Swiss-Prot record:
It is linked to Schizophrenia 19: A complex, multifactorial psychotic disorder or group of disorders characterized by disturbances in the form and content of thought (e.g. delusions, hallucinations), in mood (e.g. inappropriate affect), in sense of self and relationship to the external world (e.g. loss of ego boundaries, withdrawal), and in behavior (e.g bizarre or apparently purposeless behavior). Although it affects emotions, it is distinguished from mood disorders in which such disturbances are primary. It comes from Homo sapiens. Residues 8-13 have a biased composition (Polar residues). This is RNA-binding protein 12. The lineage of its organism: Eukaryota, Metazoa, Chordata, Craniata, Vertebrata. It is found in: Nucleus. The modification Phosphoserine is found at residues 16, 18, 20. The chain holds residues 412 to 522 of 932 of the full protein. Residues 26-103 form the RRM domain.
Length: 124
């Protein structure tokens, strides 16, 4: 194991908390994804694991470009814990951060994000 050297490029400088303890499966919040990110990229990151190809959700900008945010849900638990052990990693040539998120909270965002891509006079 060569210690070598690497670079540090933090982003967001923000944290998340929980108001009340509620039930929730195993999900992961990825930040830093590339502009051309794709379900494949999300998998290549947490390879050798059981990820619901369906669950794998990625936020896309209004210009047809990945904003740099994704979400994954590991069916099993033992496989979920490992996902967290894969922090401070670089997606090939990009840098992404791994942070645990509650299913419920995970959808919360996915909802607000869609409201940005959805085009309609209806509030929701």
């Amino acid at each position: 194991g060569s210690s070598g050297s690497s670079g540090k490029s933090p982003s967001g400088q923000k944290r998340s908390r929980s108001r009340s303890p509620h039930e929730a499966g195993f999900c992961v919040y990825l930040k830093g994804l590339p502009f051309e990110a794709e379900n494949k990229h999300v998998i290549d990151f947490f390879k050798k694991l059981d990820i619901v190809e369906d669950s794998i959700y990625i936020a896309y900008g209004p210009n047809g470009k990945a904003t740099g945010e994704g979400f994954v849900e590991f069916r099993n638990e033992a496989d979920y814990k490992a996902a967290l052990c894969r922090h401070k990693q670089y997606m090939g040539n990009r840098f992404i951060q791994v942070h645990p998120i509650t299913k419920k909270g995970m959808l919360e965002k996915i909802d607000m994000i869609r409201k940005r891509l959805q085009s309609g006079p209806s509030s929701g």
